[PDB]
Amino acid sequence: NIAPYKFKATMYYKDVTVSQVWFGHRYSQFMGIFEDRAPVPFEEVIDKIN
Amino acid sequence: QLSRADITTVSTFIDLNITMLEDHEFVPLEVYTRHEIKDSGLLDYTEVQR
Numbered sequence: 233n234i235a236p237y238k239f240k241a242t243m244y245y246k247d248v249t250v251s252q253v254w255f256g257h258r259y260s261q262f263m264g265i266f267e268d269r270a271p272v273p274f275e276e277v278i279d280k281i282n
Numbered sequence: 283q284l285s286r287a288d289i290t291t292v293s294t295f296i297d298l299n300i301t302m303l304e305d306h307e308f309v310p311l312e313v314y315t316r317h318e319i320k321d322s323g324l325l326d327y328t329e330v331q332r
């Protein structure tokens with residue numbers, strides 16, 4: 233048997249994204265963007281999502 | 283007058299039975315199809331990137 237064991241699963245995460253913006257006299261620019269996948273706790277996955 | 287089959291007959295010939303080789307049909311057979319081999323990998327860069 234070479235076929236990998238396949239099973240269904242559900243992912244839970246929050247795309248935390250905090251960006252730094254510089255406002256010029258006539259333009260806007262992104263001085264930095266930080267993207268992170270924050271996990272969801274068991275309490276929220278059970279008592280809030282499910 | 284008597285029929286030809288009324289007298290006992292003995293075969294003076296040395297019989298040789300010849301059984302021709304029966305036709306055989308070969309069906310396709312593969313241990314692992316190309317799809318199975320591709321699926322053997324745990325991860326696929328194409329699907330993951332898509």
Ligand SMILES: *[C@@H]1O[C@H](CO)[C@@H](O)[C@H](O)[C@H]1NC(C)=O
Nearest residue numbers: 293295296297298299300301
């Ligand atoms: C086949 O050969 C045998 C001898 O080996 C003979 O006795 C027989 O009559 C032949 N034919 C058949 C239909 O068996």
